Swiss-Prot record, chains A, C, D, E, F, G, H, I, J, K:
A Pfam short name: Proteasome
Domain of life per record: Bacteria
Entry keyword Protein transport: no
Primary gene name: hslV
HAMAP family in UniProt: HslV
Residues reported in the UniProt entry to bind Na(+): 163, 166, 169
Family: Belongs to the peptidase T1B family. HslV subfamily.
Record's catalysed reaction(s): ATP-dependent cleavage of peptide bonds with broad specificity
Alphabetized GO MF terms: metal ion binding; threonine-type endopeptidase activity
Source organism (scientific name): Bacillus anthracis
Record-linked SUPFAM superfamilies: N-terminal nucleophile aminohydrolases (Ntn hydrolases) (SSF56235)
Name of the protein: ATP-dependent protease subunit HslV
Activity regulation, per record: Allosterically activated by HslU binding.
Record's subcellular location: Cytoplasm
Amino acid sequence: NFHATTIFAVHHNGECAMAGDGQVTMGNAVVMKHTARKVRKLFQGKVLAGFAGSVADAFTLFEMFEGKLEEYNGNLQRAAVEMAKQWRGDKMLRQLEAMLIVMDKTTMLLVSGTGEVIEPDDGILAIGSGGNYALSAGRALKQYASEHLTAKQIAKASLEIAGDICVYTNHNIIVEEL
Amino acid sequence: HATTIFAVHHNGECAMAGDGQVTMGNAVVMKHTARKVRKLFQGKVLAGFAGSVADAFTLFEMFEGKLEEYNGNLQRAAVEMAKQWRGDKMLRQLEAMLIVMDKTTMLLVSGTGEVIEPDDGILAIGSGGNYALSAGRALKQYASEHLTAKQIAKASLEIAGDICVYTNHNIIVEEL
Amino acid sequence: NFHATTIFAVHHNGECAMAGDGQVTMGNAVVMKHTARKVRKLFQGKVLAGFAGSVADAFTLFEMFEGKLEEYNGNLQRAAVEMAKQWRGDKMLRQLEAMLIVMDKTTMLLVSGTGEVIEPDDGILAIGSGGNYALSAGRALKQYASEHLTAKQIAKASLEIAGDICVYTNHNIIVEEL
Amino acid sequence: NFHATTIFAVHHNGECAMAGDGQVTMGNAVVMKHTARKVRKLFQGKVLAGFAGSVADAFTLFEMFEGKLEEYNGNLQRAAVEMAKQWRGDKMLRQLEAMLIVMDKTTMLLVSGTGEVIEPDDGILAIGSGGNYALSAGRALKQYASEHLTAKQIAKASLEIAGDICVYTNHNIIVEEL
Amino acid sequence: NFHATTIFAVHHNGECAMAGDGQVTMGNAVVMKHTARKVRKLFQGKVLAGFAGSVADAFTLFEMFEGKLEEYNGNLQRAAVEMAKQWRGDKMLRQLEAMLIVMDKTTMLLVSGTGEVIEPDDGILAIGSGGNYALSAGRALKQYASEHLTAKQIAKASLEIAGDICVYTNHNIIVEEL
Amino acid sequence: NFHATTIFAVHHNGECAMAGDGQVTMGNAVVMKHTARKVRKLFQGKVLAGFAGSVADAFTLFEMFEGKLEEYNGNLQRAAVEMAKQWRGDKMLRQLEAMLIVMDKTTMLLVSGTGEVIEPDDGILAIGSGGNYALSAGRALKQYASEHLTAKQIAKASLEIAGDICVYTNHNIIVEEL
Amino acid sequence: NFHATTIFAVHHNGECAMAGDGQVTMGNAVVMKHTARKVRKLFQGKVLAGFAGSVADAFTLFEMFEGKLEEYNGNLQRAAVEMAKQWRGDKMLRQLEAMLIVMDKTTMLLVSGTGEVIEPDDGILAIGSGGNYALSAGRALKQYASEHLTAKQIAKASLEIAGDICVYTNHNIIVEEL
Amino acid sequence: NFHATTIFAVHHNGECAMAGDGQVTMGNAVVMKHTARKVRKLFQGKVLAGFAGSVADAFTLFEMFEGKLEEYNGNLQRAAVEMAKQWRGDKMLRQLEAMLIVMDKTTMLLVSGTGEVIEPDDGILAIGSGGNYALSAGRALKQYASEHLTAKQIAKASLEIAGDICVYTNHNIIVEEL
Amino acid sequence: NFHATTIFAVHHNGECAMAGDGQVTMGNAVVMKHTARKVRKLFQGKVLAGFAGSVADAFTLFEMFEGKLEEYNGNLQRAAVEMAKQWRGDKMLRQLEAMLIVMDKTTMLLVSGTGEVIEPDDGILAIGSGGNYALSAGRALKQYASEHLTAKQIAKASLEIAGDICVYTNHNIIVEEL
Amino acid sequence: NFHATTIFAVHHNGECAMAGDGQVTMGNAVVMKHTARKVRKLFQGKVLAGFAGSVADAFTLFEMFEGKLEEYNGNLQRAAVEMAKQWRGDKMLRQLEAMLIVMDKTTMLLVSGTGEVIEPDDGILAIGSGGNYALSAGRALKQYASEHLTAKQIAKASLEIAGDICVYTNHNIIVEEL
Amino acid sequence: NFHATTIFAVHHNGECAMAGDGQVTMGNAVVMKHTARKVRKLFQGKVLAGFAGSVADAFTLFEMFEGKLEEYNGNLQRAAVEMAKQWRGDKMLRQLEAMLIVMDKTTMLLVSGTGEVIEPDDGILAIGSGGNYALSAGRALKQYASEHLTAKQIAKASLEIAGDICVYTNHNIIVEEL
């Protein structure tokens, strides 16, 4: 019943940033902890990935995906595919409605338990309870504000706005960059 | 969604406070600053109401009306308020609840014609209602001497703010 | 089975603007008209109002409020709530899910049939199918891009952004100012 | 949470075409992606196949079906049946709502997880979100506009039409000919 | 328990047409009638109107709308609005799911009980069961087949197509021209 | 969302016939193929079987029964129930809503996944979307028109009648006899 | 909760017959009386009408309709219209899901509380719990058996077959003729 | 229809306490037990654990996690995760809504069948029926009473407040320490 | 959550009886009353009536119908209809599911809020909780015990069997005669 | 939202006692008030009454009934019948699920908004949240403990037991006599 | 479909009694069996047990538990815990909503398929259809009537009361002792 934390990833001005909040919501109305860290670097810091869902789910995926990386030599395109395939295979895992973002220097993708793999056109991806508000914020900035802001600043911001619009997203915001 | 309001009778002090969060539909907050608590009866009383602003002022007026008729007897005037609320067709459909308090006593009135007086002198309504209440009664009971009414009222809502998603941290507090 | 247009209203840098797209969606699938006009100036051009729903209701609520306006010395605040008390009263109109935005040079208000009247904190109001998206976009620009964008520009952007993402908002956008 | 892209296929004047749009809508409200490749040729370019659903799924079925195509020596009909049987069988795949269109020069078929195999009488097939709209469009053209268009031209126009009407279908369109 | 017949309307090359099928399906399974007249001209033959729903209803609205047409001196737009208002108002009529298409030489509109008034950009309107199919067909033709057909020809073909696809639409078809 | 074809089976005046229409309906609205073949002779042409549902399941159940047939000295009765005990057994197949008709020169049986095996009293069995209509038509003819119609004629009529009324049955009807 | 008795009307070989059964079903499973008479002559035996629903509903309609007759001079066409209109008007009456058949020497119609009026092409109408089976039976006979049966015999029969197929229709069958 | 007892844990000023009530409610309305043992010292008294649900589930879990600890050499954090991964692994237990608090002298963790592992930001966890009320009281006393209360006192007090408020919590309270 | 007492009426061998039990069940589980007066002689003892529902409803109805009788000069049949028409007229009572039996020395009638008036074919009516069980027993004794039992005996016996079987019927039974 | 208070009444050995608990529980788990007084003496202290529902309603009802008592000259029975007519009549009040107990020296009665009026044969009544549990105990005690106990005694005891079991009944209990 | 029998257990003044009624009510209203024996002595007549559920299940359970008793050397507590693990473990049995009471001279316990094990502090237990009503009465009597009553006496009495109120509990009652 836990509600998905909000994660955002951006490629801007030759920079890659990914942020997420710390809010943990049990049931409809209740917040257990505000400090959750949902974003991490993999492949020896070559890739930034994040997952909205459970902690033990977070790592099992992270595990088997970095597997796809090592197999596929850090090709995000083929690894995520082979990842989504293997996700779609697992009886207990297909179930997860939460999704996964991955990105490296080159690109970013979105992987789901339904076997979906999505690459954005605008180099912006957002998931989680508040992803949509975050996505609205970032695009607005990146397209319109393009030369007045960094990725770290676009990403950080995008999680603030959603933090204001959304009940399931808080203001403790962890930011990583490649 | 209904904002969270807390009322406490403590150490001779009367405080009521509420958050400012206005939640549209499911996940969306329209406004963080709404003031749900106001003085009435030339400042003799505090009232608070969870729901709509429009329905706030009708009931407030409605109640303050009772107070004038009933010579500022909160006990009597709150009862007559509940009867009347229950009589009006569209208003008796209101989910949101109403806390009134004076220096002497506090009351909770609903559109179901319910009238509640807390035995511990703490009343809290709204989304984070349960959370503020527990927080408040805990302080009152255990932390008694080390805290004031205004402080307990502030704290309870600070706590309500953190556990409850529909209670934010923008908080106004009133005192008699 | 109709899908409301998307209206956006902003007070920025001492300027005011209200804008909207024209897309109307019947069924969950179908789009008929690309351009629709629901945003109307009232009170001899001193007030911008907008409503995302049916044209019939639109005119009804508008005229109602310009009525509420006339009575009150054009006190935007009192008139809103007078309409709000009124709107709740009507058994037919009370039941509308859609909302009304009314603003002037000074401030803007969000009025609902529930009786709710809401003044925004940041000087931005959004309603309709794409409301939240534009709302997020606009807040982002306003707070972050504040120096570089006008009220006019922020509105158009928000809806345009809304149009880019939400399937129910398109890019045909009219902008009115005070 | 994803909305299917739209696929169309037509036999005309001895020409074959299959076509699909790029729009990917996640959430009932929101567009993730404007492109993808869900129509891929098979069987040494002799067969076109398309599948509206997820990437890991399309790959699985295409692979599944192509393996069938070989066992039976290029019989689209026998293949699709054994395809439909195995698909019906697989507990994880049995549940899939999206459908598969396969096509060769002589014939075209539609397969489902329910173990259905459908052969259109008029040689026009459409699946996914805007199937209804793209089906109606292409037939309308094929019958009435027959003299003035090719299969390529018909398929491009059908999706152009669904993309014009259906909120979940857009104009980024790939057309494949056999 | 009745399924609506299908109505279509198109402005083309300075020609107007409205058309409808005869099929009446009562029970989700069964056809009662192959004919009816639900498209009737109005306003001295200047206006065509059509309504997919029941006989007592069509007669009421047509009458309702025509009375509007007169008060306002042949203004289709003002009329349809006052039509949409009154319809929205009537407690018994407010509830009606079926929609009304009215049309004149210069313009065409669509009205609903919700008080909606819709003006297509491309001058093609369809309602009832096979609206989706007849809409897609006619637009497909109007855009692509433009040179080779008339408005009459388009409307006859659109319904011929919906009647070919939709199980609730048949081939007994009346076409009215202004 | 598929709609079963309509099969009709009759024993009359010392003759036997099984017939069916070809119409297949996807969605509640759409019709793709007008002509479908689900009625198959088995046991070296000594038995007519028919099944209204998916071709995959069709072949599966058919082959199953012709299996049950082979074991039993072609005792139609025992074989039915052996299949019926079997059909219930399979967890995947048990759940089918559709039914199977099996007959020979002597008699006909109605077999379901529930385990039910039914021999008709009047020598008529009907299944599929139009089953009840044809069933009613056929019984009418058989009982009343008994002198003037053959088994062959009664079947064709029933389905034709079924086709006339039920939106899901069409008039393309193949007739097989023993 | 009572279940609608079954009524059938036929124009055949220059004869008009209308039959209905006597079964009265309370709740889902329960039968209170088997003898109900739902068919009667009106207009001094000039017209045969029947109603599936309640007894007090039966007569209020019968009353106000014969009203339409006398007003309209026994024109079944205009009276039924004016009837359906007046039915559609009544707050308590629109509610009735049961319907009304009327016929005279010339023709037959079906009137509903939704303001529907339907005239069959084949001169056969059937309503009530078992109308569909009855309709299937009669058409079969009238079209195929045309010269071997009277209306009284077609009508009577049609209620027998349905009487066999349907749980809510019994074998006490009243027959009237014009 | 069973209601969990209430369990509360706190790390305060260098000490730790875990406490629980005794009330077990059957149906929504009824109490049988006034007391129990639901908070059990594990790992030779080095860790505290409690679980709100059934005794049998608990003793499965407790022993299971007690297993993990041994395996992982007392690492609370790494043990929790392998438990959760295992908990969510088993398809019988994964269904458990109730959650587990584990505690040592350093940190505390909250574990759910979902695979979630949570470390409170405040060093406070509560589970079961009065769970919300406990958490509110405790956090209230930890932050504003901080000087005047100890861990055990707060555990005692928090469960004391819930029992006053929550209808499913009583005043029989046992506190465990490390 | 209230359960009607049980009432049974019979016309047998020139005599009549109406009887009822005393059990009133509150909730699905609970009995308070063992007895009542629910079957009341009307029209100066000339007719018998009973109603299964609330006392207040009854006394409304009884007096209401007692009104009709006077109006119509004791005609049971014509009175019943105007009652029913009136009963169904009132929008507060029309909602009553419970039904009324009225009886004189000649015939008996069953009246519902729906507007239904029913004359049993067998001269037997039952209403209320054990209603089905009573009717079964009574009809059983009337047809196969006919020589050996009287009206009062059967009333007594029928309600005696229901009380044995129906959980909502007891053995306190009062019989009224005309 | 709130849970009804629990009231118990008893006639024992010539003495009357009506008692109630104080607990008012709002929302699923939450107790707002420890002490409530909803049991009133009426009619010169000759009548006891209680209502488990809201305080306002208690007034209106007690008010309403005392008028019936006086109009009917202290006749508890006709005053109860008339009130139940008025109550059932009121559009607002009829909706109340909570019930009323009234009692004098001779008898005790229960009344509802459905118009029911109940007299227990054993002279014990109970309503509200522990209504079931209080009745049993009281009836248990009255019957078996008859010699050793009084009315007040049994009354006090019954709620004491109810309050001991029922989660929603406390121990703050007021008893009254006559 | 069936309703559970009602069993009551009591520890009073040093003596143990477990009693049950016979009534078996199938379907909503219908009583199939007046006398049932589901309470068994186990472990050399040292243990009383009862199960309100089906006879077969009673066997399997009683069987299962007596094994636990012996494995655990008559330890009612660990035998109860282990059984509840086995019970909760069984895929078939876990689903049982009916519960088990077991008792010896020292204590009494209640067990469920969810793995719960319950010890009442007042040494009274009740299960099945009147479970609530029997407990209250027993706890009522034990507490207040303690001097005048025995275990058998209170046991017999409790079910007697339950059977007097609960519609689903009869008076055919078997009591057992230790």
